[PDB]
Amino acid sequence: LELDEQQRKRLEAFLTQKQKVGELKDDDFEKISELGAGNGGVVFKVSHKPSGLVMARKLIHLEIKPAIRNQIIRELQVLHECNSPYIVGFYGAFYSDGEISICMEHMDGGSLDQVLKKAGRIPEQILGKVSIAVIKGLTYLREKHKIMHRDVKPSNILVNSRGEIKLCDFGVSGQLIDAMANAFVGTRSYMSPERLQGTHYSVQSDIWSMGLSLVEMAVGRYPIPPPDAKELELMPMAIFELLDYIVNEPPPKLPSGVFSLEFQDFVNKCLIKNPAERADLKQLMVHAFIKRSDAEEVDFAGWLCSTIGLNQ
Amino acid sequence: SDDWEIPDGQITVGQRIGSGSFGTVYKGKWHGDVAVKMLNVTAPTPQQLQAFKNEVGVLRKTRHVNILLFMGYSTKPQLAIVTQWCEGSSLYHHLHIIETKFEMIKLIDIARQTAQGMDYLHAKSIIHRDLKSNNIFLHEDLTVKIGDFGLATVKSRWSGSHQFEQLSGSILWMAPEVIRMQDKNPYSFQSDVYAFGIVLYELMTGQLPYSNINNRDQIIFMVGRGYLSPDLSKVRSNCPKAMKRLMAECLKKKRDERPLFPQILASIELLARSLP
Ligand SMILES: Nc1ncnc2c1ncn2[C@@H]1O[C@H](COP(=O)(O)OP(=O)(O)NP(=O)(O)O)[C@@H](O)[C@H]1O
Ligand SMILES: Nc1ncnc2c1ncn2[C@@H]1O[C@H](COP(=O)(O)OP(=O)(O)NP(=O)(O)O)[C@@H](O)[C@H]1O
Ligand SMILES: O=C(NOC[C@H](O)CO)c1ccc(F)c(F)c1Nc1ccc(I)cc1F
Ligand SMILES: [Cl-]
Ligand SMILES: [Mg+2]
Ligand SMILES: [Mg+2]
Numbered sequence: 264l265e266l267d268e269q270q271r272k273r274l275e276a277f278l279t280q281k282q283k284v285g286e287l288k289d290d291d292f293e294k295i296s297e298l299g300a301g302n303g304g305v306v307f308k309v310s311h312k313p314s315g316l317v318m319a320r321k322l323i324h325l326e327i328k329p330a331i332r333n334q335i336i337r338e339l340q341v342l343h344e345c346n347s348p349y350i351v352g353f354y355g356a357f358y359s360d361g362e363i364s365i366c367m368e369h370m371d372g373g374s375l376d377q378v379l380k381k382a383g384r385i386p387e388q389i390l391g392k393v394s395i396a397v398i399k400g401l402t403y404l405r406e407k408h409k410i411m412h413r414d415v416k417p418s419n420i421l422v423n424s425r426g427e428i429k430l431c432d433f434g435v436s437g438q439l440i441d442a443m444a445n446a447f448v449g450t451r452s453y454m455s456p457e458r459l460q461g462t463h464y465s466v467q468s469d470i471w472s473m474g475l476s477l478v479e480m481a482v483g484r485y486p487i488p489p490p491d492a493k494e495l496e497l498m499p500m501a502i503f504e505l506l507d508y509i510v511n512e513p514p515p516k517l518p519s520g521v522f523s524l525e526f527q528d529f530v531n532k533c534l535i536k537n538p539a540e541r542a543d544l545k546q547l548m549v550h551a552f553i554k555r556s557d558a559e560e561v562d563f564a565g566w567l568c569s570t571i572g573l574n575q
Numbered sequence: 576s577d578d579w580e581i582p583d584g585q586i587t588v589g590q591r592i593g594s595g596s597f598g599t600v601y602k603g604k605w606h607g608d609v610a611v612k613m614l615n616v617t618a619p620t621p622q623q624l625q626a627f628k629n630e631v632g633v634l635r636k637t638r639h640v641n642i643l644l645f646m647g648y649s650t651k652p653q654l655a656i657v658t659q660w661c662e663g664s665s666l667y668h669h670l671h672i673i674e675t676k677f678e679m680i681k682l683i684d685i686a687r688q689t690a691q692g693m694d695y696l697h698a699k700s701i702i703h704r705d706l707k708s709n710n711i712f713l714h715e716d717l718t719v720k721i722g723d724f725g726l727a728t729v730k731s732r733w734s735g736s737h738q739f740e741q742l743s744g745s746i747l748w749m750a751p752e753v754i755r756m757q758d759k760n761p762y763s764f765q766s767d768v769y770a771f772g773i774v775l776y777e778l779m780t781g782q783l784p785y786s787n788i789n790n791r792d793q794i795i796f797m798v799g800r801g802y803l804s805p806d807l808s809k810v811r812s813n814c815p816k817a818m819k820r821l822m823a824e825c826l827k828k829k830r831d832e833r834p835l836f837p838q839i840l841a842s843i844e845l846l847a848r849s850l851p
Contacts, residue, residue: 324593326709328672361593437789444791445783448742454792460802461793501756502742506796 264403270348273425277352277368283314287355287366292320299374301418303447308369311354318354319370323363325442332358338436339365345408349400351421351431363439367431372422372567375480379417382570384483387526391556392563393420393480394529396428397473398553402544405466410435415472416453417480424573426564450502451485456510457538464538471541474533478515481522481530486515525552576650577628579635583651586611595723596705596744597730598656608660609646616729617653623733624650630728637699641692643712643722654729658722662715667708670777679813680850682778685711686818687843688719693771694836697764701725704762706770707748708777727762746795747783748773751828754799765830768839772825773805779818780809801828817846 266274291313298306298319309320325332339356342365346352352368372378375393379385385393397420404410413434421429434440453475455468478486482498487505495518500508514534517527529552532542547553568575576582587604588611594600598612605611619627627648634645644659666685669675677685689711696703703710703724710723731738740756742749750769753761776784784805785794797803805826810819821842827833834842 326593326668326672328674441789444789444794445747446745448744448746448791448795450741452792454790458790459793459796461788461790461797499739501740502792503755503795503799504757506792507800510796 264347266348273427274346274348278346280314280316281352281354284311284316284354285313287311287357287364289359289364298369299377302449303443309366311366316354317369318366319368321365321367323365323439323443324361325363325446327442331438331442332363335363335436335438335442338438341408341435345404345410345435347400347403347407348427349396349403349429351429368429370421370423370427370429371573372424372571374418375420375422375476376416376418378422378567378570379480379483381572382483385480386566387481387522388556388559388561389563389566390477390480390526391552391559392561393428394473394477394547395553395557396420397430397476398544398547400430401466401469401473402548404430404433405544408435411466412469412472413440414453415469415476417476420476422563422567424564424568424575426562426567428563448502451487452502452505452509454506454509455538456514456536459506459510462538466544467538467541470533470543470547471538474530475515477530477533478517481517481526488512489515523552525550525555528552579631579647581605581647581649581657583649586649586655586657595709597726602660603657605646605657610658610660611649612656612658614654614656614729616732618732619654619729620733620735622736623728623738627654627728630725633699633701634725637696637701637724639692639695641688641719641721642695642724643720656726659720661712661720661722663713665709666711666713666719666774666777669713670708670781671783674781679815680847683815683818683843683847683850685713685719686775686778687840687847689721689771689774690836690840690843692719692721693767694840696721696724697767697836702727702762702764703767703770704730705744706767706774707745708774709745711774742795746791746798747785749798750830751799751801752830754795763830764835765833768825768833768835769827769830771836771839772822772833775818775822775825776805776807776810779811779814779822781811782809804828815846815850817842817849821846 291311293310295308298308304321304323306319306321309318311318336356336358342353354366356365401412411434414432419432421431453472455471457464458468487508514536517530529550535541585605589602592600598614601611603609603611631648647657649655704727705723712720714720731740748770750766752758753766788794824834
């Protein structure tokens, strides 16, 4: 991989810690605290006593046949090969006590969903760095593994006090995705309009999801349906209606005047409903917004710790 | 305390079994084995609590051989529903986890008993609201017991007297108009019939619907819009033609086109007799 000297240093340190971790067993973990819960899972900060490591442990309770469960556990093992500065590190996936455990690196900044609540709105110059990290994460996953994320959203972009921005919860296991489709529901959606209608345009839907996520973090509010009038100058829809809106209504857009023209063009190109006219990953990486963001010096770690209340 | 309310510290709460769309189930002891479902609604307003008690007064009178016995409720330490503990597995576990090989005479009989219990619920004017094979138990490998019916008041958290209803748990059994959540009353006898149609699908195919689609939001949108419906050609070859027809009638997109359970029960019973 490309990697500056610092990124290759942290990547190496992670592989070193990972060698201390043999087989993961439920008895070897100690609960520290809860990190959050989704609509189909729960994540705990834990200590792995044999290794001394702190990890985030996601537990998923699926009532599925053992052959499907075993395939899910097999497919997740590919996460051992997913090593990139823009991908949440991975320690192991196993089954025990009716629960699928996925043990990953602990990100002390939380998700950008949490960060967004604490920030109100995330500044454009911070969003530039986030976009670079997401584009690069999605590129890594597609080029090195043929993986399509399929779940880009603020709660699946994790950050930490070192300033790293990393993707997680991507579709390494199509069996896991399918089992979860059968068992749970969300309350909102970042799915692209063409996939809602059953059309598959590779990573173009992840790009749509990103654009949607960037609008939500820019304005401080999930953007389907668009803000109504005076709501915007301060600067609940059911799941089916949200999906119908995505499919049948024009895509969201940033407010004018508040954001740079490059940033507005960048999200507009992401949110084109036509998945072929939508920008792809190569085109976004050279977009003016990204070229500008990549050259700005932004103390992302400083801004995050400040936003969260942590120390430097 | 109140009628059919179990006071604090009478139920010995044992092992946690799992959680579903609106609660978390524990195995418990209270004059025998019970399932205790701790409701997600932990903080209920006086209006919500009152409407819940009124609903419990209805549910506790729904006694029938194919209905899981409603045993009581608790408010302390937390809101909870106490029901008969089922030995063995739900129909969902039998079909999709154990892969129990039933013969066709016994698949029909499971559908018969379910229609029997659903017929009773509707005769008592109760919308189930949540029929699915996880809520059908084959008790002691013999009798079908339908569970988790009614309880509309606790399937949504309340902001005063108004409650916002959101989809929760699996969507596979929801009728198009339940998915849409747009009508005044999305839930109806006919939306139960649709869910039963899906149960029939599981019995006659051995599979959940939409097995070829792993994108949940595509399913929600397309089922809701009427663009997508169960693939009836997955039905196994030994399924009687009349059962396939009945299934298709239960699954009609327009609720007014769906039969009711007296007619459904009469069809299955006829089919059971005119069967090898
Ligand atoms: N590696 C991690 N380190 C720290 N916090 C984490 C980590 N992974 C997940 N979390 C937190 O755990 C929360 C729950 O995650 P998750 O179960 O994937 O649901 P979700 O992404 O928040 N929402 P949803 O996917 O719609 O069900 C996330 O929002 C994060 O706040
Ligand atoms: N009366 C019961 N006896 C034994 N096991 C039960 C009983 N009720 C529920 N369970 C089990 O407890 C777990 C949780 O059930 P539950 O919370 O009802 O979710 P669900 O049935 O899968 N979906 P839903 O009922 O719509 O919320 C499942 O493994 C059930 O099989
Ligand atoms: O976790 C996933 N989705 O979110 C789950 C929430 O609990 C839903 O509420 C998920 C879905 C498909 C898949 F293949 C995975 F590998 C998943 N998990 C997953 C993937 C990479 C890392 I590094 C860490 C992880 F955990
Ligand atoms: Cl408890
Ligand atoms: Mg997540
Ligand atoms: Mg249930």
